[PDB]
C-alpha cells in the first residue's frame, strides 16, 4: 500500500527508465544473470550465453528486456489497481516458466541496483523507498497467486 506521494515518486523514477527502456532492460537482465547464474537456466533462449560480453552483444536479450520492463511499467502505472495485468503474469510464471518467487526478489533488487548505477546521485532516498515498496507490492500480489496455485 502506497500513498499518492509515493506513487508520484515511483512514476517520476519510471520516467528515467522510459527514456531508454532497452538499455535499462538489458542492464537489469545482465545484473540478474551475472549475480544469480541459476536464473539463466530458466531461459532456453539465453542459456547459450556464457560470458557477459556475449550477454551485452545479444540483441535478443535487449529485446526481452524491453518486453519485461514494458510489462512492469504498465503495472506500475495502475498504482496498485493491477489485478487484470498481474494475473496472467503470475499464471505464466508459476505454470509455464516455473519461476520461484525468490527470483522475483532477485530482479527487484537488481532494478534498484541498476537505477543507482545509471543515475548515481539522482536516485534519492525517498525515491528508493517508494520504488522498493512498489516492487514489494508487485511481488506480494504475485505471491498470493502462487499460493493459490500451490506453486513453490
Ligand atoms: C519484473 C518482473 C518480470 C516481469 C514484469 C516479467 C514479464 C514477462 C513477460 C511480459 C513475458 C512474456 C509473456 C509471458 O510469458 O508471460 C515474460 C517471459 C518470461 N519470463 Fe518473465 N518477467 C519478470 C521476471 C522474470 C524472472 C525473475 C524470470 C526468471 C528468472 C523470468 C523468466 C521468464 C521466462 C523464462 C520467460 C519466457 C521467455 C521466452 O522464452 O521467450 N521472468 N516475462
Domain 1-152 has CATH 1.10.10.60: no
Q: How far apart are CA 57 and CA 62, in angstroms?
A: 9
Residue with CA closest to ligand 1 atom 33: 97
**Binding site residue list:** 64, 93
**Binding site residue list for nitrite:** 64
If one residue of 67, 76, 99 were mutated to test the ligand 1 pocket, choosing by the most ligand atoms within 8 A of its CB, it would be: 99
Q: How far apart are CA 48 and CA 35, in angstroms?
A: 17
Ligand 1 midpoint to CA 68 (Å): 6
Contact predicate 13/134, CB 8 Å: no
Residue 121 φ/ψ, nearest 5 degrees: 80, -5
Contact predicate 149/142, CB 8 Å: no
Resolution in A: 1.4
Amino acid at each position: 500500500g502506497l500513498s499518492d506521494g509515493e506513487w508520484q515518486q515511483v512514476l517520476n523514477v519510471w520516467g528515467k527508465v522510459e527514456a531508454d527502456i532497452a538499455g535499462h532492460g538489458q542492464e537489469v537482465l545482465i545484473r540478474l544473470f551475472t549475480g544469480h547464474p541459476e536464473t539463466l537456466e530458466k531461459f532456453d533462449k539465453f542459456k547459450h550465453l556464457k560470458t557477459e560480453a556475449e550477454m551485452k552483444a545479444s540483441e535478443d536479450l535487449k529485446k526481452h528486456g524491453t518486453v519485461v520492463l514494458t510489462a512492469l511499467g504498465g503495472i506500475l502505472k495502475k498504482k496498485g489497481h493491477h489485478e487484470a495485468e498481474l494475473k496472467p503474469l503470475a499464471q505464466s510464471h508459476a505454470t509455464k516458466h516455473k519461476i520461484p518467487i525468490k527470483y522475483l526478489e532477485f530482479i527487484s533488487d537488481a532494478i534498484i541496483h541498476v537505477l543507482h548505477s545509471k543515475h548515481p546521485g539522482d536516485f534519492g532516498a525517498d525515491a528508493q523507498g517508494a520504488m522498493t515498496k512498489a516492487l514489494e507490492l508487485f511481488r506480494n500480489d504475485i505471491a498470493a497467486k502462487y499460493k493459490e496455485l500451490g506453486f513453490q
